[PDB]
Enzyme design. Structure first.
Site, mmCIF file in Angstrom:
data_model
loop_
_atom_site.group_PDB
_atom_site.id
_atom_site.type_symbol
_atom_site.label_atom_id
_atom_site.label_comp_id
_atom_site.label_asym_id
_atom_site.label_seq_id
_atom_site.Cartn_x
_atom_site.Cartn_y
_atom_site.Cartn_z
ATOM 1 N N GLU A 22 0.809 -1.219 0.000
ATOM 2 C CA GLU A 22 0.000 0.000 0.000
ATOM 3 C C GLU A 22 0.845 1.273 0.000
ATOM 4 O O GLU A 22 0.682 2.125 0.864
ATOM 5 C CB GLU A 22 -0.975 0.007 1.183
ATOM 6 N N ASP A 23 1.743 1.381 -0.977
ATOM 7 C CA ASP A 23 2.623 2.543 -1.158
ATOM 8 C C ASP A 23 3.731 2.671 -0.112
ATOM 9 O O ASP A 23 4.596 3.535 -0.234
ATOM 10 C CB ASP A 23 1.833 3.858 -1.252
ATOM 11 N N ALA A 24 3.712 1.818 0.907
ATOM 12 C CA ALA A 24 4.747 1.858 1.936
ATOM 13 C C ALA A 24 6.115 1.516 1.348
ATOM 14 O O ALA A 24 6.212 0.964 0.254
ATOM 15 C CB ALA A 24 4.403 0.924 3.087
#
Ligand SMILES: [Zn+2]
Lengths: 279, 36, 258, 94, 42, 50, 50, 63
Positions: A22-24
């Site tokens: 999730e974009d982390a």
């Protein structure tokens, strides 16, 4: 080029441990501990020796342990002879920077440092205003290591937050000896359509090997396939990927791992200034 | 007047992933835990 | 069956081929070399005055980055509980002029910066710098400043390239140009991977048929290098010692359980 | 390096190994896989964040040996191997 | 107890105004205290 | 995302996990002692786990 | 001291305490859910991925 | 800001090879060969010296 704002992170693309989803984004512990992505925060507070029209005045002096607005304790521990801190004295919480003293119509009103802020004094200037009133400006610096939660983003709108800081030991290494600085989840690429980031990775790899800085100016930069065809003759798979070994167990992953050097920028969104609670 | 009169414990921070904690669990920074 | 073959011995670095082990053990070795094998480094610094172009924290960190000589013949570098022996690396300088690492004064002739040519900070007129950095033993797992150096290893593999593959000669030439062992016979060429061997896309279509790779079971090629803190051979030695001591400690814990 | 016993059963031992990391844990597990009598031998770190880092080991045998003895065997294997390797090592620089 | 733009310190107190009586300058600088300062080098 | 990709790889026609992988990684979940792990479907090519 | 029963302590957050996690904008009800505190260092909230 | 003492990824000494690097390239000698003549194996450690900016030659001329 004379005043940049970011660093070339040798980024690896895979989801490790599931902490970059999730974009982390996952960060090499060692690299951080060696300087990479460190920055300093600066904040200057000011204190103007206001002269009230009634004849009264402020006067910056160490607030005498008395009554009226007095904070008590050694919150004034850092103050000097004049009630102004000296450089390199650790600041924290509601520490007094300059001891004020406003008369009736005497209170404290001494300028104290911000809540979720700390750090060390740097410069304590002193001067006058157009009014002819003694002005004191004290600036405080705060060392800021890229910790968990800080925001990072490349020049491709690929924003992300540090999800986990993993030791270089657990960090996977390429047969050539390369260890990732920032590991981005492979799920944040095919959904979005940002080819320029991948091309930039390859270009940074070529640039690192050859010695050329590579021209990526819009419309007039090397067609990607040329950097791909040069990268190999420099000694590396065309595909931007290499053989990577799992630092935990040890068997090399049964695939190729796209590793590049993409320029990441640290944004001013530091978790140090986001977190706060209410009692 | 009257017709013009009747007229006219928490915390916040960045989030990070953690597939190593229970699905109903939440990671709270121990500093936040010491304030709340 | 344990066997070594030192390929090269360079200034404070070494390349070798370990054989007769496996993945697990080699990783124990490497990870131990990185995060366990201790050296000397600046933990904290007591500044007396800093009128230089850098902040106290930046300079301090840089000091922590300077490789410090770690005498293996004087301290137990294989110990699980290291000695808290403190070394005082002090300096009092004034501009103009650039401050190098070799300008540092040591309270122990055995513990000094391994490299005296490391730029620290430029001092201008009236810029004084006085400090007494404290150096202790530490491990890479706590902070990378204490890391003795670096180790990277790969599977020692053989690449069989059948002469049915058009222009195999180019592969041979590439291998010899890069210094990889090439064996030739009445069929294919065998390339020994003491280092990464990236086949051309031109040959990627033969990946499988004419060209195939086989791993040599148990044989890994390692490259170990330091910074001047420790002799490069000594690091490996100490790592192995750490392994032994850890296992021993573990059994000691086992006996007092039952 | 402290052993925190989580749970004991007949030919079964689950425990934390305080002060250890992936290095020794992994090595010990893969070393434990050589004993044919060891039915199970695994670890995981259900805590990758705090300073703990400590792992969680689980070793299960078939009755013909206690988990403890199997552990001693594994660590002994490690010791002997590291010593042999060290001897070849020093006996190389020539 | 002070300094300004490119020279030397001044004495303490005040009564009328504040400009450096050695430069004619208006800005004063509090020099860092020469005492002990432990900076934990991480 | 990865849960989906991981579920696919885990439940593939050619999904054969050596003991090292199955045994060490089931500790990310739980549930074994007796009649759970049993018994290694494939010993054809090699003793392995589908 | 002799606190005796009936007093009240304001203790720091313990692992397991009932806590509401919220992300704005709060569209459906599913935007506010009850969670179990698991105290950890660093300075961010950890949310399990599913 | 004076060559990141050592390196980031490859974390070995590199500051000590700043001057001669620059000066060797400041004659026309291609950096990608100059580096080779010095202790510059992997590119990760090479990057730290390639893309550096030495902003300090501005900052000192102040205070
Ligand atoms: Zn490097």
């Amino acid at each position: 080029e004379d005043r940049p704002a970011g660093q070339n992170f040798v980024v690896a693309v895979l989801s490790y441990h599931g902490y970059n989803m999730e974009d982390a984004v996952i960060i090499n512990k060692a690299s951080i501990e060696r300087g990479l992505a460190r920055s300093t925060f600066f904040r200057t507070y000011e204190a103007e020796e206001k002269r009230y029209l009634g004849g009264q005045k402020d006067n910056f002096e160490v607030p005498s342990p008395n009554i009226q607005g007095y904070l008590g304790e050694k919150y004034y521990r850092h103050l000097d002879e004049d009630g102004l801190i000296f450089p390199e004295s650790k600041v924290e919480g509601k520490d007094v920077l300059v001891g004020r003293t406003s008369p009736p119509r005497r209170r404290e009103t001494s300028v104290t440092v911000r809540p979720s802020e700390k750090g060390v004094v740097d410069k304590v200037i002193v001067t006058e205003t157009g009014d002819g009133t003694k002005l004191v400006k004290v600036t405080v610096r705060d060392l800021r290591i890229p910790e968990l939660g800080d925001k990072f983003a490349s020049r491709h709108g690929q924003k992300g937050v540090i999800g986990l800081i993993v030791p270089q030991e657990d960090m996977p290494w390429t047969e050539s000896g390369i260890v990732p600085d920032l590991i981005v989840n492979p799920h944040g690429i095919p959904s979005r359509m940002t080819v320029g980031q991948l091309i930039e990775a390859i270009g940074g790899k070529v640039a690192s090997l050859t010695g050329r800085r590579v021209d990526g100016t819009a419309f007039i930069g090397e067609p990607e396939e040329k950097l791909r065809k040069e990268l190999e003759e420099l000694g590396f798979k065309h595909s931007g990927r290499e053989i990577m070994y799992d630092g935990i167990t040890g068997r090399r992953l049964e695939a190729d791992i796209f590793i590049g050097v993409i320029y990441y920028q640290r944004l001013h969104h530091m978790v140090a200034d986001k977190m706060h609670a209410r009692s | 007047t009257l017709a013009q009169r009747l007229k006219g414990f928490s915390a916040r921070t960045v989030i990070s992933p953690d597939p190593m904690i229970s699905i109903n669990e939440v990671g709270v920074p121990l500093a936040v835990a010491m304030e709340l | 069956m344990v066997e070594f073959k030192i390929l090269e011995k360079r200034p404070d670095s070494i390349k070798f081929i370990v054989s007769g082990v496996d993945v697990p053990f080699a990783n124990a070795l490497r990870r131990t070399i990185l995060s366990e094998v201790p050296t000397f480094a600046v933990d904290e610094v007591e500044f007396l005055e800093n009128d230089s172009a850098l902040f106290d924290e930046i300079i301090a960190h840089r000091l922590a980055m300077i490789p410090l000589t770690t005498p293996h013949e004087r301290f137990s570098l294989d110990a699980l509980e290291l000695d808290d022996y403190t070394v005082t690396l002090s300096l009092e300088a004034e501009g103009p002029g650039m401050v190098y690492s070799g300008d540092l004064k040591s309270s122990d002739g055995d513990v000094k910066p391994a490299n005296p040519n490391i730029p620290i900070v430029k001092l201008a007129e009236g810029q004084r710098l006085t400090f007494n950095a404290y150096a202790r033993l530490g491990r890479g797992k706590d902070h990378a400043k204490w890391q003795p150096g670096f180790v990277y290893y790969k599977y020692l593999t053989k690449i069989h390239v059948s002469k049915d593959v058009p222009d195999w000669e180019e592969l041979k030439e590439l291998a010899e140009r890069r210094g990889l062992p090439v064996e030739e016979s009445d069929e294919e060429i065998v390339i020994t991977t003491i280092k990464a061997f990236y086949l051309p896309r031109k040959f990627e279509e033969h990946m499988g048929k004419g060209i195939r790779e086989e791993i040599v079971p148990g044989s890994f090629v390692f490259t170990v290098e330091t910074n001047g803190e420790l002799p490069v051979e000594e690091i490996v030695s100490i790592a192995l010692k750490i392994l032994m001591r850890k296992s021993d400690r573990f059994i000691n814990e086992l006996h007092k359980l039952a | 390096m402290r052993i925190e016993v989580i749970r004991r059963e007949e030919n079964l031992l689950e425990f934390y190994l305080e002060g250890e990391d992936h290095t020794f844990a992994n090595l010990l597990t893969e070393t434990l896989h050589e004993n044919e009598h060891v039915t199970f031998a695994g670890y995981t770190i259900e805590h990758p964040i705090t300073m703990a880092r400590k792992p969680r080991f689980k070793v299960v045998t078939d009755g013909k040996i206690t988990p403890e003895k199997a552990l001693e065997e594994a660590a002994q294997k490690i010791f002997d191997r590291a010593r042999e390797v060290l001897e070849a090592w020093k006996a190389a620089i020539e | 107890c002070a300094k300004c733009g490119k020279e030397v310190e001044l004495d303490l107190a005040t009564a009328r105004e504040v400009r450096c009586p050695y430069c004619g300058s208006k800005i004063l600088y509090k020099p860092r205290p020469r005492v002990a300062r432990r900076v934990k080098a991480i | 995302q990865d849960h989906i990709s991981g579920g696919y790889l885990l439940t593939r026609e050619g999904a054969y996990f050596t003991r090292y992988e199955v045994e060490q990684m089931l500790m990310f979940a739980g549930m074994d002692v007796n009649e759970l792990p049993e018994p290694d479907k494939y010993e054809n090519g090699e003793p392995l786990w589908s | 001291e002799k606190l005796d029963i009936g007093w009240t302590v304001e203790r720091h957050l313990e692992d397991g305490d009932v806590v509401l996690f919220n992300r704005q904008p709060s569209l459906h009800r599913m935007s506010i859910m009850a969670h179990r505190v698991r105290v950890m260092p660093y300075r961010t909230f950890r949310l399990n991925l599913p | 800001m004076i060559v990141p003492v050592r390196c980031f990824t490859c974390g070995k000494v590199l500051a000590d090879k700043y001057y001669e690097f620059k000066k060797r390239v400041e004659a026309g000698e291609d950096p990608g060969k100059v580096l080779d003549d010095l202790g510059v194996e992997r590119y990760c450690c090479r990057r730290t010296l390639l893309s550096h900016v030495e902003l300090i030659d501005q900052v000192m001329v102040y205070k």
